[PDB]
Amino acid sequence: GLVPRGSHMYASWTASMSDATQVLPGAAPAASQSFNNQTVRHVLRLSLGGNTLRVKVSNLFGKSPITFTAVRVAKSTGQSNIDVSTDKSVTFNGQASVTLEAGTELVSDAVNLEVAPLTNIAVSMYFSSPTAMPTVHALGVQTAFIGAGNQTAATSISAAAADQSQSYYGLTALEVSSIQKTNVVVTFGDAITDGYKSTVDASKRYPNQLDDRLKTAGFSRIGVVNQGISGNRWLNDFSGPSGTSRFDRDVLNVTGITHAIILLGVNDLGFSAWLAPTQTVTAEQVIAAMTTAIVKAKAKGIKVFVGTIIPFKGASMGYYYTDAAEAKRQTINTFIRNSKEIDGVIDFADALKNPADPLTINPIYDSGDALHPNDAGYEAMAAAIDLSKLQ
């Protein structure tokens, strides 16, 4: 019969936030990027369509307040171009401008813009004042366009190509409303979830390719959102907040989450040889962090899947990959494969390993650094997932 008409919001796109100024122990300080009477137009792919949308902006890692002078949305027509007939003001309690204190985030009012799954929209922000923006998604695998003055409603961004970025600035979620029964799959992890070495602007991250499989099978109401951070670790900050500290924000608190795919840990193992020798961790400490995250998500009724850690022999031998890192990887993967607490294993390691040597990534799936997959490898990761488990 008729689907009950109650409308609800669902996360359609996400980006986990990092503090661009945080550095490793013993490292030199790093400056945040700043805007000053400038517009940044972001482009993002929606996983879920629907009738209205809202934008979640962020000053989570600011050291002082920031003011979004204007925020607007429109359908993207490629590069920095928009369909101006779809341009809409994004308001916050009815106001076009909004100030976020340091450490806070805010979701906008609903915007009356009907949107379709697997389409791109542009989210444009104008900062009239000098604005430090340490709160970023560093590796967006997507071009952002920066121009002078308030260009938020302009058909394109007029500026030099050298001003472009591949980050997201203070933009962390896009939610879209629907009356339909809807699942939301959160992919949580590091660069291999984030999509590092997949083709920029091509939507070839593994969660994108999983999304493609779902829609091709007819499940337009099963969404996939990306909560990967390149360089992320379970147990220590950098790159990005530790996985254990961000799990509530980036997984449990995602609007409409029903399923989580967790793939995290290789950087806990790889960072201690050289990047961060004071942060050596054991497989047992990684397993303890995973355990607590699994317990919390299951207590919320979320279906929890854990991926095995993909082989990475050859990745900066002696300085990231080591015999100690491999032994920890083996222990962690054995724990994952035999766990009765999780709803299922996704054996990414088995799917991507080299038939000639299981400690290395399959050459056809290797971006070239022995650690990050290429587009074909991210396609193979998505192909290894049982879609009946996301129902």
**Which residues of this protein are in contact with Na ion, per CB under 5 A?**
19, 61, 249, 253
- Closest to Na ion by CB, 92 vs 365, is 92
- Closest to Cl ion by CB, 89 vs 285, is 89
Q: Please, what is the minimum distance in Å from the beta carbon of residue 57 to Cl ion? A: 18
- Residue 89: name its binding partner from Cl ion, Na ion, none (Cβ under 5 to 8 Å by kind): Cl ion
Q: Give backbone dihedrals phi and psi of 133, rounded to 5 degrees, phi first.
A: -125, 70
Local structure of 277: helix, strand or coil: helix
- Residue 34: name its binding partner from Cl ion, Na ion, none (Cβ under 5 to 8 Å by kind): none
- Residue 156: name its binding partner from Na ion, Cl ion, none (Cβ under 5 to 8 Å by kind): none
- Residue 175: name its binding partner from Cl ion, Na ion, none (Cβ under 5 to 8 Å by kind): none
What does each C-alpha distance from 17 to 11, 171, 359 come to in angstroms?
A: 15, 8, 32
Q: Please, what is the minimum distance in Å from the beta carbon of residue 255 to Na ion? A: 8
Binding site for Cl ion (CB under 5 A): 89
What lies within 8 Å, CB to CB, of 260 at 6+ separation is: 185, 186, 187, 188, 251, 297, 302, 303, 304, 305
Q: How far apart are CA 240 and CA 16, in angstroms?
A: 9
The residue sitting closest to Na ion, measured at its beta carbon, is 253
Q: Please, what is the minimum distance in Å from the beta carbon of residue 296 to Na ion? A: 14
What does each C-alpha distance from 189 to 80, 155, 246, 308 come to in angstroms?
A: 29, 35, 11, 12
Bridge partners, residue 125, by sequence: 40, 71
- Closest to Cl ion by CB, 32 vs 367, is 367
Q: How far apart are CA 21 and CA 33, in angstroms?
A: 9
The residue among 238, 240, 239, 328 whose CA lies nearest residue 290 is: 328
Q: Please, what is the minimum distance in Å from the beta carbon of residue 317 to Na ion? A: 34
- Closest to Cl ion by CB, 89 vs 282, is 89
The residue sitting closest to Cl ion, measured at its beta carbon, is 89
- Residue 35: name its binding partner from Cl ion, Na ion, none (Cβ under 5 to 8 Å by kind): none
- Closest to Cl ion by CB, 141 vs 146, is 141
The residue among 297, 304, 269 whose CA lies nearest residue 284 is: 269
Q: Please, what is the minimum distance in Å from the beta carbon of residue 70 to Cl ion? A: 9
Dihedral angle sign, alpha carbons of residues 213, 216, 221, 226: positive
- Closest to Cl ion by CB, 89 vs 143, is 89
- Closest to Na ion by CB, 180 vs 253, is 253
Q: Please, what is the minimum distance in Å from the beta carbon of residue 135 to Na ion? A: 8
- Residue 61: name its binding partner from Na ion, Cl ion, none (Cβ under 5 to 8 Å by kind): Na ion
Q: Please, what is the minimum distance in Å from the beta carbon of residue 48 to Cl ion? A: 25
- Closest to Cl ion by CB, 237 vs 375, is 375
Bridge partners, residue 110, by sequence: none
Q: Please, what is the minimum distance in Å from the beta carbon of residue 163 to Cl ion? A: 19
User: For residues 342 and 351, is the Cβ–Cβ distance under 8 A?
Assistant: no
- Residue 253: name its binding partner from Cl ion, Na ion, none (Cβ under 5 to 8 Å by kind): Na ion
The residue among 46, 176, 179, 59 whose CA lies nearest residue 122 is: 46
Which helix (H) or strand (E) is 168 found in, with range?
Answer: strand 168-169
Name the DSSP letter for residue 252: I
